[PDB]
Amino acid sequence: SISFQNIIEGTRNFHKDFLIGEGEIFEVYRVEITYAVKLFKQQCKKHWKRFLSELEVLLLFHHPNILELAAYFTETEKFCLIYPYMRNGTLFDRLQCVGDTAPLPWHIRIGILIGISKAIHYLHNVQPCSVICGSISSANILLDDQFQPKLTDFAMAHFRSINMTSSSSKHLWYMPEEYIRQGKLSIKTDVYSFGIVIMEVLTGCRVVLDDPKHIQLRDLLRELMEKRGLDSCLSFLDKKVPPCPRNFSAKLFCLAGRCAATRAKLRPSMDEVLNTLESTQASLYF
Amino acid sequence: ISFQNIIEGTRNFHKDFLIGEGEIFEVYRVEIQNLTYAVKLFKQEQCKKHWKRFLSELEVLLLFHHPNILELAAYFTETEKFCLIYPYMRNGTLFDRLQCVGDTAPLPWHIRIGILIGISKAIHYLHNVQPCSVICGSISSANILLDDQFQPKLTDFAMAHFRSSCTINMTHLWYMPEEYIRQGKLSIKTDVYSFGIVIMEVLTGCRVVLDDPKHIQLRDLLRELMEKRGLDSCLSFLDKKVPPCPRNFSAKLFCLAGRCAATRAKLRPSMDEVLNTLESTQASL
Ligand SMILES: [Hg+2]
Ligand SMILES: [Hg+2]
Ligand SMILES: [Hg+2]
């Protein structure tokens, strides 16, 4: 519980110095009472629909693996959303090791890979009408001081039971083919985007590889186990951390490939993604 | 508040506590902590359509406040049951008051125009909110509640839309203009058309559809009176349940209700112009 005047001077009148980042339709600030506030960036036709979907899901749906909405402010012709600040920051920031931080151990990886997996199952089976997260990525997964994950960016979340202009630019590299070439946003578009972030925690590489040709990490691993070999995928395992059992590594490449499939019918559901993902956690420690 | 209070004060949502059943919700009466409230429950029972309307209620009630809009005091998401609770307005809905359902004292004119002004103030507020203009799309004499001091409160924003000149896939429409019915077009001027119906419904005290065998509508009847025999005949349909109002008063409201319910949307006046007319005609009373 806070007031607007606490934020007005707290964010130093939205000072450019007190900014954590500017995303698609927001520009996140840092506030202390510490919090992170998302200020509505003002074509309201589509930007406003997103701000709604964000506040819709957070108020109506709660889960320990979802960044909990603290409060909302609609005052002084300004809309904004306040959030509890995450100490570990973005997943993408920690497994890429920005700021020369410590790499993520394998047990935390499979830990926050299950945590996010548990939430996306919760959302796919909400009672009124199932909701599709849509914009899931290693950039929208935050980690607290205990390194436990939190979802973000429910702006392109849709309820289910179809327009490419409505897309999120940064989330392009996670979208399936039926979403791009056919516009069909399915229930299985989250398991697709989740199979890619499994690849990102197995191989500490970026979403799109920095090679001169600028090829996708999905397509690279898509061709290794398709032609060369399943163990050839293991050549790209993140070397910044000590090794892990070959059965733990194999089961995750086996799963990520089935999740990040072009054809939608052959793509699994989050429950069995979570079943195979918790059993893999035992293969690590044994 | 607490959802445990609601489930008790409604007796597991028993039939004896519902005040009315809307198309997509269920309204119940709940009294907790020496105060009474009106809970409105999602008609759980397709999925996608009814759910979107649910969000329309919650969005505009949390983002936009005005003295002439029924506040949302709490909302609950637990036990898969999604309900909205409202401060119970003890003077019922405008419709029930114009019809004197419980043999209530019929509304005097000064209250009748106070209500018209209050609702026009709220609709003006919504049409000019900063992020995107919101249009109500569900104005009715049954969606206008009256507090203890007979001050109008606007409800039922389930059909509301955010506009930057719009469209609605069409898949009991007595207040909607001919472009919404025939062409699906819905706009800011759609509210003023429905607001004109209310002015007609306030002046006459009649129902929107007259309870006769042929079921002729109100505006269609008043149209005939004003086109054929002019404004002098419209004044014969003033509400006889209350003493006569000044002719200058009643004459300006009929002309106003005529423009507000103009058949073609291009001509209908902006809600700002209406509030100006409603204020200057209260002085004439
Ligand atoms: Hg692979
Ligand atoms: Hg008339
Ligand atoms: Hg007149």
Author numbering:
A (entry chain B): 152 to 184, 188 to 196, 201 to 319, 328 to 452
B (entry chain A): 153 to 197, 201 to 319, 325 to 331, 337 to 450
Paper passage:
Interleukin-1 receptor associated kinases (IRAKs) are key players in innate immune signaling that mediate the host response to pathogens. In contrast to the active kinases IRAK1 and IRAK4, IRAK2 and IRAK3 are pseudokinases lacking catalytic activity and their functions are poorly understood. IRAK3 is thought to be a negative regulator of innate immune signaling and mutations in IRAK3 are associated with asthma and cancer. The canonical catalytic “HRD”-motif is missing entirely in IRAK3 and replaced with “CGS,” whereas the Mg2+-coordinating “DFG”-motif is slightly altered to “DFA.
Here we report the crystal structure of the pseudokinase domain of human IRAK3 at 2.9 Å resolution, which reveals a closed, pseudoactive conformation with an evolutionarily conserved cysteine residue located in the regulatory spine (R-spine). The asymmetric unit (ASU) contains 3 molecules of IRAK3. The αC-helix of IRAK3 is in an inward-oriented position with an intact KE-salt bridge formed by K192 of the β3-strand and E212 of the αC-helix. Another hallmark of an active kinase conformation in IRAK3 is the intact regulatory spine (R-spine) formed by L227, L216, F312, C291, and L309. The presence of this evolutionarily conserved cysteine residue in the R-spine of IRAK3 suggests the possibility of a redox-based mechanism that controls R-spine assembly. Closer inspection of the G-loop interactions in the IRAK3 structure revealed that F177 anchors the G-loop to residues of the αC-helix, β3-and β4-strands and to the Mg-binding loop. The hydrophobic anchor F177 thereby leads to a rigidification of the G-loop and keeps the loop ordered in the apo-form of IRAK3. The dimers are formed via a pseudosymmetric “head-to-head” arrangement with the αC-helices as central elements of the dimer interface. The interface is flanked by two disulfide bonds formed between C202 at the start of the αC-helices and C287 of the αE-β6-loops. We further identify a conserved C-lobe surface on IRAK3 that harbors asthma-associated mutations and closely resembles the previously reported IRAK4 homodimer interface.
